[PDB]
Amino acid sequence: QGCAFEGESCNVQFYPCCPGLGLTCIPGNPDGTCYYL
Numbered sequence: 001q002g003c004a005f006e007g008e009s010c011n012v013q014f015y016p017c018c019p020g021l022g023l024t025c026i027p028g029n030p031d032g033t034c035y036y037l
Contacts (some may be wrong), residue, residue, distance in 0.1 A: 004009075004018060005032065005034055006023055009031055012031075022037050023037070
């Protein structure tokens, strides 16, 4: 797996979130959480 799904943590340094569906990393500096917008 490359990108993270909703509910887990995502690192904007090596492991980003899965785009296309509408997910974002919060805070994402450097670690974040994948949530739906």
